[PDB]
Structure formats: C-alpha cells, structure tokens
C-alpha cells in the first residue's frame with residue numbers, strides 16, 4: 037500500500053517497493069537503486085504472466101528455476117514481489133537481480149579480442165553445462181538474454197523452451213527433429229561466429245528462408261540426416277537444390293582476425309576449428325559441451341538438484357496457474 041509507489045517506464049507503469057529508487061529503463065526492465073542494500077539492481081516486470089496457459093507455464097517454470105538452479109553463470113534473484121495484496125487482486129510480478137553492464141549484443145559489436153571471446157565462450161559453456169546437469173536443455177539461447185559486467189563476467193538470464201526470429205535455433209529444432217544436449221552447442225556457435233563477423237550468421241527473412249541461409253553457407257546435409265525428418269518436412273528439404281557451402285576459412289576469412297604474429301595465426305586457426313565443430317547441422321556430428329570445454333581455444337580457462345519434471349508435464353487451468361504463481365511469489 038504505502039510500501040509502494042508508481043513510475044512510468046516507457047509505455048508502462050512500474051509499481052515497486054519504495055526501497056527501489058530512480059528507475060531508468062534499460063521484456064520490461066529498469067535499472068534502479070536499492071536504498072536498503074545501497075546497491076544498483078535490475079528490475080523486470082512480468083505483466084499478467086497468466087495471460088494464457090502458455091505465458092503462464094513459462095512464467096512459473098522460470099520463477100521456480102531462478103531459485104533452485106544456482107551457478108555463477110546463471111541468473112540469481114535478489115528479490116521477488118507483487119504490489120497486489122490478495123490472490124483475487126493479483127496481477128503483476130516483479131523480479132529483482134544484480135544490475136549488469138551490457139548484454140552480448142553490444143559485446144558482439146566490439147572489435148575482435150581472442151582473450152575476451154574465449155573467456156565469454158568459456159563461461160557460456162559452463163553455464164550451459166550446469167543447466168544440462170540440472171536437467172534443463174535450453175534450445176533458445178540468444179545474445180539478447182545473456183548479460184555481462186565490464187570485467188567480462190557473464191550470466192544467462194532465462195531457461196529456454198518448454199518440454200519469426202529463429203536466428204540462433206538449431207536445425208533439429210527448426211525441423212522438429214527432437215534433440216539432445218548438444219542442441220545448445222549450435223547456438224553458442226552462432227554467437228561465436230557473430231562475434232567474428234559482427235553480423236548475424238543466418239538472418240532468415242522467414243522461418244523457412246532461415247533454413248536456406250544455413251545450407252547456403254554450411255552445405256546441404258548428407259542424406260543420412262534427412263531420414264530422421266518427418267514425411268512432410270523430409271519432402272521439402274530432400275527435394276531441394278543441393279548446396280556445397282563454403283569451407284570454414286572462407287566463411288570466416290583471415291581478414292576478420294588479428295594477424296601479423298604467429299600467436300594471432302594460431303588463435304585464428306583454433307577459433308575456426310572450434311567454429312567448424314559447433315556449426316554442424318547434423319547433431320550426431322556436432323561437438324558436445326564437455327568436448328567444447330576441452331578445446332584448445334577454450335581450455336586455457338581451466339552439485340545440481342533433482343529436477344521436478346512436473347515442471348514441464350503438468351498443464352493447468354488459467355485460474356490454477358495464477359494461484360501457483362502467486363504462491364511462489366509469496367514465498368520469498
């Protein structure tokens with residue numbers, strides 16, 4: 037009541053505890069100063085996350101995982117609150133975490149630096165490894181939901197898909213082929229390659245021109261792969277102009293890298309090598325997390341909890357989702 041005040045942020049209103057002051061905008065996220073803690077924080081507003089059964093299962097899963105998956109490269113919450121006083125009146129959820137400096141999208145725009153790039157990839161792989169260890173296969177990693185401080189410490193912000201822009205999604209996901217752990221490796225590869233090219237690797241104009249930009253560059257998969265494709269998806273892909281692709285030196289030429297020293301030549305070779313092992317259409321030929329972590333480009337950088345599967349299985353009425361979420365917000 038008198039514990040809260042409201043402030044316009046973009047097109048919306050943030051109603052937050054009075055400890056959170058001087059909200060500035062950075063879906064809906066602001067930077068604030070926490071007066072009690074004497075620290076800067078980031079505050080995210082989930083507005084009516086029970087909009088439907090889909091907004092709801094995600095919001096609930098996300099909220100539960102943020103308080104049970106604990107790892108330095110994974111989001112951890114400082115606080116969770118709602119300004120509403122009762123289940124009946126309940127509408128908004130506010131999540132509060134440490135304020136970081138930038139997300140990977142900005143980092144990608146910086147000139148290429150091997151030490152920094154291999155450092156960011158190391159941490160990303162470590163986060164993912166721990167996620168896999170905690171029973172989470174993500175499938176939806178993207179530069180916009182990965183954040184960093186200026187000392188280049190990194191955090192993944194969300195927990196991915198249940199169970200138009202798909203630039204970072206693995207081929208087995210785009211074609212509905214079912215998946216394993218190394219599905220997240222493709223996304224890391226997309227991100228690595230973007231840090232080198234300073235441009236999105238596979239900028240499809242539609243969720244089907246996306247497939248085109250992948251094969252144009254990497255080549256048509258071997259036929260063995262197209263078998264795992266459903267009858268209707270297999271038809272499209274199989275009966276389609278074959279592409280040879282480019283070799284990895286040509287996808288990522290010398291000119292994109294530091295040079296003029298053998299160390300810089302060594303580093304460009306290692307990076308392309310790693311790239312060629314992650315950007316592999318066929319998941320059965322794609323490198324694993326453990327292997328990527330042992331890779332020369334990466335390895336120079338040196339327990340989880342029992343996953344509740346009902347977290348994904350159980351579907352609910354909108355009314356019950358609301359009550360599950362509310363209950364989670366109230367157990368600070």
Ligand SMILES: COc1cc(NC(=O)c2cccc(-n3ncc4cc(Nc5ccccc5F)ccc43)c2)cc(OC)c1OC
Pocket residue numbers: 060062065067076078079080111131132133134135136137138139183193194
């Ligand atoms: C002027 O405002 C300041 C902004 C800055 N850093 C920026 O601008 C910046 C850029 C990109 C990303 C982030 N950043 N940090 C945390 C963060 C969290 C989310 N999402 C989210 C939040 C809570 C719970 C779950 C969530 F998924 C989204 C973006 C985020 C900040 C630094 C500052 O100083 C350290 C600022 O001055 C106070």
